[PDB]
Write a protein that binds this DNA or RNA. Structure first.
Ligand SMILES: O=c1ccn([C@H]2C[C@H](O)[C@@H](COP(=O)(O)NP(=O)(O)OP(=O)(O)O)O2)c(=O)[nH]1
Ligand SMILES: [Cl-]
Ligand SMILES: [Cl-]
Ligand SMILES: [Cl-]
Ligand SMILES: [Cl-]
Ligand SMILES: [Mg+2]
Ligand SMILES: [Mg+2]
Ligand code: NA
Ligand code: NA
Length: 326
DNA sequence: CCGACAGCGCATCAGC
DNA sequence: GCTGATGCGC
DNA sequence: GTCGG
């Protein structure tokens, strides 16, 4: 955290462009800049020094100079003092409420947590659950609790069918000491790119996890992706653990590596890797890596037997999960 | 200067 | 009912 | 907002 003040600023700017300005490219520009500076091993002394890094342009260089000199950014000072912007940024912190819905509610006068609770009828299912656990979803999950959750999920899945393989990905797989949520990759031999020999593969797992009262709510659910809420069991006389967000993704077993690569992230790392892939003549998604024909159209899936194989195709030295936190 | 900026699942809606 | 566009999230 | 060509 040598340049914590600077990356925080960029992150706030990014959030402003996404939530308030609805300028997604600026949002990603600020995030990339924050990401490149976050791994820079020196305490930045000036915007010029920063401009040397890829992703940091003139505009950001000037802001970094203003920040280093005064310790703040006038542009952000004003944004903070602006009711509308402040309200919109806040409402987007509720899962299910995005920039559009946030601005829509703010236009209706609904701009505080209190307002949301009294107008619960104006929220869809997801937003309603996000509001319900607003506080809990803000807390981090210690890795020790993640290990507990992992044991529960792997053991409950095993009980449904010994052939299932549940892998915890996301920040957890990257070795994080704390995670925002739990991300679970799921595979079963009956579900491949060639066929789905068994229906409800994801449903059954969800069902079992709900039966043992691990999963408490559902935000969204389909044939291959479950988005919900879970909670560790507490002991007698013991205070209850906070409710946690849990994501489960069922991927074709023969496409596990592209899947675990995707789900392990980070998101910025995935963006960088997928962008680099293109420059090399390939396109990567969570299922496959395909070559790009002279017309730009994606060819057929290339053989893959490990995460490393994907890195080789794009001429990138393999990077352990723990080093993909960009 | 200009176009590119990663890729996709689920929920909701408009138009038919 | 369907398809396609859009919002939101991973 | 930044970048390559
Ligand atoms: O925009 C996105 C979001 C997520 N992802 C992938 C990578 C990410 O690591 C994974 C899980 O998403 P989360 O939002 O759960 N993030 P992560 O687990 O990395 O961190 P956190 O501790 O915040 O959950 O999904 C993308 O590829 N693109
Ligand atoms: Cl933009
Ligand atoms: Cl500031
Ligand atoms: Cl694969
Ligand atoms: Cl594909
Ligand atoms: Mg996660
Ligand atoms: Mg997640
Ligand atoms: Na730069
Ligand atoms: Na939100």
């Amino acid at each position: 955290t040598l340049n914590g003040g600077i990356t925080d600023m960029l992150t706030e700017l990014a959030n402003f462009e996404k939530n308030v300005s609805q300028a997604i490219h600026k949002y990603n520009a600020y995030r990339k800049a924050a990401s490149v500076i976050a791994k820079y091993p020196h305490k930045i002394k000036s915007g010029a020094e920063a401009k040397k890094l890829p992703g940091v342009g003139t505009k950001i260089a000037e802001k970094i100079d203003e920040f280093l000199a005064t310790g703040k950014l006038r542009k952000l000072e004003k944004i903070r003092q602006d009711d509308t912007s402040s309200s919109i940024n806040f409402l987007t912190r509720v899962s299910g409420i995005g920039p559009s819905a946030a601005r829509k509610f703010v236009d209706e006068g609904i701009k505080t947590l209190e307002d949301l609770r009294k107008n619960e009828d104006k929220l869809n299912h997801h937003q309603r659950i996000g509001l319900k656990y607003f506080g809990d979803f803000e807390k981090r999950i210690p890795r020790e609790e993640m290990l507990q959750m992992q044991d529960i999920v792997l053991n409950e899945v095993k009980k449904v069918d010994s052939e299932y393989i549940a892998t915890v990905c996301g920040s957890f797989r990257r070795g994080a000491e704390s995670s925002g949520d739990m991300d679970v990759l799921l595979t079963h031999p009956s579900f491949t790119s060639e066929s789905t020999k068994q229906p409800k593969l994801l449903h059954q797992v969800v069902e079992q996890l709900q039966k043992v009262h691990f999963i408490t709510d559902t935000l969204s659910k389909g044939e291959t992706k479950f988005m919900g809420v879970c909670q560790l069991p507490s002991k007698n006389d013991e205070k209850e653990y906070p409710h946690r967000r849990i994501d489960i993704r069922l991927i074709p077993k023969d496409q596990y590596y592209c899947g675990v690569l995707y789900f392990t992230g980070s998101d910025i790392f995935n963006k960088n890797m997928r962008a680099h892939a293109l420059e090399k003549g390939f396109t990567i998604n969570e299922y496959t890596i395909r070559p790009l024909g002279v017309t730009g159209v994606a060819g057929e899936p290339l053989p893959v037997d490990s995460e490393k194989d994907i890195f080789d195709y794009i001429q990138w030295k393999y990077r352990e999960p723990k080093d993909r936190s960009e």
